[PDB]
Amino acid sequence: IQRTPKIQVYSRHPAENGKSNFLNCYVSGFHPSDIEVDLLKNGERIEKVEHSDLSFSKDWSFYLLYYTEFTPTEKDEYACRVNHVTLSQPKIVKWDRDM
Amino acid sequence: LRNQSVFNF
């Protein structure tokens, strides 16, 4: 029995072009715990990406926060790419400043 | 502060 991750891509503070912020990808509600998470800048993998220590919810499902410091702009597109044993292919969720 | 006790299944 396996649970597929829920994925949310968002910023720490409300986005303002030219101002430093943090880009977050929160993955949650998944089982087993092995998971691959990438943050993308214009479709390419961001190198400086940290993550929280593995923890779990009351229903035993796992959650992780992946994050990086970034300066949002009008042109630059950001996304989060997730792979897990429940996914036949990597799922990409685009960053939408309104979500 | 953690529980120091050890128990096995």
Partner: protein, 276 residues
């Protein structure tokens, strides 16, 4: 208000890739304060909150010793569970344990916990009485019998009612600046046209602590439970949390909708509307 202390443990076997990875974290409410990772360069119980840094080296040694002993018993338990569930030694399996206590505003014990899961399913749990067990199946019933013979529940009860509550009280006082401060949510409503005939109203809550919050939309004063899209509460990365609730509204009917916000940091629940 009310508070909790919890320790979470996860062991994940990886046959053919060395020994199981063990990761354990401790929290007071929604604040991480200690972590231990068996895959770290020098595994130790590491402080993760400024208010715990004051604890001495004898304290770090104790905690590290417990984490190492728990990684070892988990490795033994993962082998045991292969036998109890008649499984091959080829697959990866997960063992999870949580234990802790809840206290009220007066610091008295509200309840204690000790529970385990195997491969993401309940295995065995200490009941709220701190004296009896709930076993999920005939394999967990074997552990129940062993734990009843060893009077494990009595040992757990003594820790949960004693050290667990006393150290939670100690941490709450040492961390009173952050642990006993509730940050109310920063709230606003955004409007997003979907088409000529409908738009999205999204009610936001940002920068709040602790994570617990209630965000709801009403139409003419009636809760819109079925029609509200509610995202899971999410960490911002600066200790605070975020959440939003959205409803699809027909053009021109925006003033029939109201957003309701409940949070510990709020003396009274808030009511918001889409302003322009």
């Amino acid at each position: 208000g009310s508070h909790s202390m919890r320790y979470f443990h996860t062991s994940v076997s990886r046959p053919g890739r060395g020994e199981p990875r063990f990761i354990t974290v401790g929290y007071v409410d929604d604040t991480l304060f200690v972590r231990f990772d068996s895959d770290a360069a020098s595994p130790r119980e590491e402080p993760r909150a400024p208010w715990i840094e004051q604890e001495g080296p004898e304290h770090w040694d104790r905690e590290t010793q417990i984490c190492k002993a728990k990684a070892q018993t988990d490795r033994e338990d993962l082998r045991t569970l292969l036998r109890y569930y008649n499984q091959s030694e080829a697959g990866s399996h997960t063992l999870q344990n949580m234990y802790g206590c809840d206290v009220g505003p007066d610091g008295r014990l509200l309840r204690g916990y000790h529970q385990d899961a195997y491969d993401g399913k309940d295995y065995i749990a200490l009941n709220e009485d701190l004296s009896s067990w709930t076993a999920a199946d005939t394999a967990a019933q074997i552990t129940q019998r062993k734990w009843e013979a060893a009077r494990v529940a009595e040992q757990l009860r003594a820790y949960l009612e004693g050290e667990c509550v006393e150290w939670l009280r100690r941490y709450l006082e040492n961390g009173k600046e952050t642990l006993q401060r509730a940050d109310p949510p920063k709230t606003h409503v955004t409007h997003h046209p979907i088409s000529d005939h409908e738009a999205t109203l999204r009610c936001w809550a940002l920068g709040f602590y602790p994570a617990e919050i209630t965000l709801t939309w009403q139409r003419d004063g009636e809760d819109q439970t079925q029609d509200t899209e509610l995202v899971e509460t999410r960490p911002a990365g600066d200790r605070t949390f975020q959440k939003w609730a959205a409803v699809v509204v027909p053009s021109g009917e925006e003033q029939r909708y109201t957003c309701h916000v409940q949070h510990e940091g709020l003396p009274k629940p808030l009511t918001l509307r889409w302003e322009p």
